[PDB]
Design a protein around this ligand. Structure first.
Ligand SMILES: CCCS(=O)(=O)Nc1cc(-c2cc(-c3ccc(N4CCNCC4)cc3)cnc2N)ccc1OC
Ligand SMILES: CCCS(=O)(=O)Nc1cc(-c2cc(-c3ccc(N4CCNCC4)cc3)cnc2N)ccc1OC
Lengths: 282, 286
């Protein structure tokens, strides 16, 4: 009964555009609003076909209808004959991929921060699932997860390399789908390692996973230093099971994770974040 | 063209309710969601149809003003047994507590105070630049909640200090004015740079109303506002122009944001987190 219309931001109110990152889904730039006096990110894509506009609008309204504390907050759409793009909050620290694999800038990443990030990811995906109707991500990657000033998760890219996160039952030309990806991410988050490093052709990855093989679980990929190691390992291995029905919903995962995050003090999170900024500063 | 329906949260999905604080605008409790697995705050009642209509008005105003510094509403609980607004849980409470709880919060680094002022101005300016412009007309340190990282979140669109004189007799038809809000902001800025109660010496609020209608404002001196305050002169000019006897002399929030940006720009990004962690540590162990 209570509807809210996504504001249409005029293009000429967006100053200081700068290419932030290009990718398959389009190009993302940074800008600042003339009236709101705040920084924002803009995702855009020749003239515009009607299908392209329809897909961009689908994505924008999906962001608008799934507003949650850990879902990328959309601010408005810029829809003009000259330009068309989605406006959202600017996430300075970029994607989780950079955080994980930029060991020069990010030498250490305290376990409290890693687990808080995992928890917020699960929370975002679970809220998307608990919508009506249930909203399916169908494409979770360490590149979709953006991190704000305090390294809090913000998920993006919900609507219609990238093979690491695909369940085996999709090779043959669902809710469980998403959890699979999540499991993988957890692995890639506790190890800071590329899944299937030794494999050079992605079809090798597809073959190994279709044979029921997953990334290595050993002493090197996951050190014993990792907190709550055994629970995380059980969660991961059951979360990427060959059979979809055996994979748990995100609510079971949240119930399993909450006591894990509960062992970290509130201040240790900020300590890890500020230590990360300091190691990156020096 | 893009509509978004506020989810209707069932009452039975709110577990572990606890009276957090009662007040004029109603009572706010804390609770936890069964499916979303997150903590939330719930504003509830003490029901006529007029009350329900007003609650729906508040809910739709919060939902239509979704902004980074506006209290994020999650859903509405509309059942015959209960009716309430559900929003994000702001653990550290309101700005008033931060300012005047010197036991838990002995020191408050200037970077964080300026971040809070900046975010307040940003939220109010966003409210003004809407279509149509939405007026707060009741800004106080109790409306400003503080999230996990002490980021400002405005809500709710001895409490007269933040009301301009032309609003005491509410000329609603005549002077439901834009400048009103800026007045409030000025006062808060003072109370944020001094950590002191405006009109401390006055004990009767009607005396405060008379004095303010007489063109009197809080004192600006060496004690209320020490010279230690960063950018002291610029902030003092902002305050004095924000509570001018004449409403038209008070600037829009866009002018204030344009003046504040260069001030916030002088603090490095890490100093904010350092001040916040210092606040969290001083509040602990006490
Ligand atoms: C294909 C669309 C990307 S996305 O799939 O992740 N989604 C999506 C994302 C964003 C967004 C992105 C970023 C960002 C900034 C810097 C960097 N790095 C440093 C500079 N060089 C490259 C690496 C990485 C990411 C910040 N803030 C945002 N708000 C904005 C809108 C979006 O709309 C779906
Ligand atoms: C009480 C003012 C109402 S309000 O004017 O600020 N508006 C409004 C606010 C809220 C809200 C409030 C709180 C909150 C938490 C701790 C405390 N303290 C601790 C115990 N001692 C007293 C002080 C006070 C408030 C947290 N999170 C929320 N989300 C929820 C809905 C609202 O309705 C729009």
């Amino acid at each position: 009964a209570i509807c809210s219309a996504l504001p249409t931001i005029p293009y000429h109110k967006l100053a200081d555009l700068r290419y932030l990152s290009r990718g398959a889904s389009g190009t993302v730039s940074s800008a600042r609003h003339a009236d709101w006096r705040v920084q924002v990110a803009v995702k855009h894509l020749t003239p515009l076909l009607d299908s392209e506009r329809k897909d961009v609008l689908r994505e924008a309204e999906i962001l608008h209808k799934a507003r949650f504390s850990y879902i990328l907050p959309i601010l408005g759409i810029c829809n003009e004959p000259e330009f068309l793009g989605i406006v959202t909050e600017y996430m300075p620290n970029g994607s989780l991929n950079e955080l994980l694999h930029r060991k020069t800038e990010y030498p250490d990443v305290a376990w409290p921060l890693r687990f808080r990030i995992l928890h917020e990811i699960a929370l975002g995906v679970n809220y998307l699932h608990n919508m009506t109707p249930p909203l399916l991500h169908h494409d979770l990657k360490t590149q979709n997860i953006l991190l704000d000033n305090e390294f809090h998760v913000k998920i993006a890219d919900f609507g219609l390399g990238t093979i690491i996160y695909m369940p085996p039952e999709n090779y043959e030309p669902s809710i469980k789908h998403d959890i699979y990806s999540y499991a993988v991410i957890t692995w890639e988050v506790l190890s800071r390692k590329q899944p299937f490093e030794d494999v050079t052709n992605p079809l090798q990855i597809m073959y190994s996973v279709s044979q029921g093989h997953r990334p290595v679980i050993n002493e090197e990929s996951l050190p014993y230093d990792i907190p709550h190691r055994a629970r995380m390992i059980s969660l991961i291995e059951s979360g990427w099971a060959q059979n979809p029905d055996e994979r748990p919903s995100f609510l079971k995962c949240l119930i399993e994770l909450e006591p894990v995050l509960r062992t970290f003090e509130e201040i240790t999170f900020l300590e890890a974040v500020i230590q990360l900024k300091k190691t990156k500063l020096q």
